[PDB]
Structure formats: C-alpha cells, structure tokens
C-alpha cells in the first residue's frame, strides 16, 4: 500500500479525504483528553483547532506529568493529522503544528528516532514557507532543537534527502487544487491560493536540497525526473495574476540551478517543458502590470542569456515565435527599468548575437535609443536615477563597439 509520507504502517497525506487516523487507532489513545483533542482536529472548525493545539501544546510543555501519553499510538495519529494541519489557511495553525512537532522531537529523542523520517521533512517544509511569520520561528526553534548548531541542520538536508524528495513529489505530482481543498467547502480562488502556497514551499525546499547536496541529481535521478516532468512546478511561471512574483522568481532560480548542475542538458524533455513555459510567461508582461513585475525582469533576462548558451540558442526553437515574444518583452520592459536591467539586457545581447537572434540595427539599436529617451524625460527625479543611467551608458558603449562589423 502507498503510505505516502508515512514510514510506519499508516498512510500520511496532505489531501483531505485519506490518510486519516483509523477510528480504532484513535480509541486506543492513552487519555480521554487526547481522544477529544484529536477528534477536534479532524473537524473543519478552525476556531476549536487553535484551542485543541494549544491544549496539546500545554500537555507537551509539561512533559514531566505527561509522558506515558506520548507513545507510538500518539505519534502515528499525530503524524497523520500534522500533514493536514500544515496546509491550513490560518497561519497560526501551521505555526503551532510545527512547534508541537519540534517540541516532540526535542522531548522524545531516541524514542522518536523511528518517526523522524515522517516529521523532519514536514518541519523543513515549514522553514521553506515564503511567509516569514511561519518559516522564521520554525527554523529558530528547529535550530534550537539541535544544540543551536546550523551544521546539525545542514545534515538533516542530506540524511533525509530521499524523504524530502518524496514530500516534493507528493505535493507536485500526486496532489492538486481539488485534493488539497474540498470543493464542497471552498471556492476556486481559495483552492488555488491554498495549493499555490504549498507547492511554492516545495519549490524552495527543492532548491535548498541542491544547495546542501552536491550529488543530489545522480543519487536521486529517478525521483527528480518524476517531479520535474510534471507540469505543476512550471505552471508557477505566471505573472498574470493575482499572486506576487516570489514563487515566480523561485522557479527561475530552480531552472538556473538545474542548468548549472548540467541536469537539464541531460533531460531535454524537462528543459523543453520549463523553457516553453518560461517563454510563454514573457507575454504576461504589459503596461498594465509592468510596475508590479519590473523588479524580476533582470532575473528573466539573465536566465535567458544563460539558457542561450545551450547548443547555440536551441532553446529559442522550442517556441516558433520566440523572437517576436522577446521583442515585445523588451519594448515593454524598457519603459520601467530597474537596477541590473541593462546589465542583463547586454548579457542577452552578448550571448544571442552569436547566432544573430535579433538584428543589430533594426531591433537592438532602437531598443537602446528609446531606452535613453525614457530615462532623460522622466529622471533624475525618481530613485536610483544615477545608478540606472550610468548602467545604461556603460552597457550601450559596449554594445556600440560591435557596430563595426555590422555596417
Ligand atoms: K499537481
């Protein structure tokens, strides 16, 4: 049987309809107080959950009196609902749930070693939550749980890399908008936003896994292929609305790491999947939303310059109208340039000229011309006027020195 995130006989999942504590297992709990606490956590009413978690948290803080209660039956049950609690919209529920688990690890050391495979990956997922109101306190209490040693934390990323990837796979491949949220009690927007948060956390977790493990690609090739071949991660490459750009930038970073490590060159199918979605997202940038998106444009351009190095600009062939997309993307983005922008544009020019992607005089030159025109009319009133203006001229002069052979 597929136990999902579970490694001790019971199924642990993030969805709402399975991986639930068996009614018999619950009745076998030590104290009648626990039975009610758990029955309270299996409901939907989130008000009574905050108290139930508070009560449970109190029983664990007073570990002296209460200890025989926190046995294997408790850990099996808790490990199942813990997974479902950390996807709640109420950040208090997610935070308290993490603290409880962290407290259990810190208190039942050795006695809980068997369950660490189930708890650590979810704790770390909490530290990867883009909301710092949850990810910072979680990481703090976690770091404190291990003698305040950040090296002991970095070890966790290596020890549990298999279970960490399995968690990613569960979020990305197996669950979706309609399994993380019950359509009967949740609107479409609610479901989307909820799933977005969870998968966004998974992408960051996935990135941290490459940071801490130099051989992750080779040691987990089959697991990574399943994760990255799915469409779900790459669907995050969306700048339309309503989400901010945090998740978007995180995927950019993932693509970069994957390319740098030489993973994507090894998996053309996955690279085609990511790039197609990346190129399509360029069309999401308009005058309507340029002011919300402009701080991530240097990242886009730099990534495209990097990818252009693959097989002499082969990535551009993944989209029949990639040239047109880039042109329209450049014309929009020059209206609201930010620091690093012109450095990135030149990076793209310097790389793509090797196969004459865009015309020097009919396409590149007017871009630079209209750019300085924009900078002169508005600035230098705006902030970072001097920095950006100087950045433009430094890069244009380098661009202009190629006008030699292009004549
Ligand atoms: K999915």
UniProtKB/Swiss-Prot annotation:
Gene ablation phenotype (knockout): Formation of detergent-resistant aggregates and inclusions composed of stalled proteins: defects are caused by inability to ubiquitinate and degrade stalled proteins. CAT-tailed protein species tend to aggregate and sequester chaperones and can induce proteotoxic stress.
HEAT repeats: 28-65, 114-151, 162-204, 249-288, 291-335
Subcellular localization: Nucleus; Cytoplasm, Cytosol
Highest taxon of source: Eukaryota
Family: Belongs to the LTN1 family.
Function, in words: E3 ubiquitin-protein ligase component of the ribosome quality control complex (RQC), a ribosome-associated complex that mediates ubiquitination and extraction of incompletely synthesized nascent chains for proteasomal degradation. Mediates ubiquitination of proteins derived from mRNAs lacking stop codons (non-stop proteins) and other translation arrest products induced by poly-lysine sequences and tandem rare codons. Ubiquitination leads to CDC48 recruitment for extraction and degradation of the incomplete translation product. May indirectly play a role in chromatin function and transcription.
Other remarks on this protein: Present with 222 molecules/cell in log phase SD medium.
Oligomer and partners: Component of the ribosome quality control complex (RQC), composed of the E3 ubiquitin ligase RKR1/LTN1, RQC1 and RQC2, as well as CDC48 and its ubiquitin-binding cofactors associated with the 60S ribosomal subunits.
Protein name per UniProt: E3 ubiquitin-protein ligase listerin
Origin species: Saccharomyces cerevisiae (strain ATCC 204508 / S288c)
Parent-record interval covered: 14 to 420 of 1562
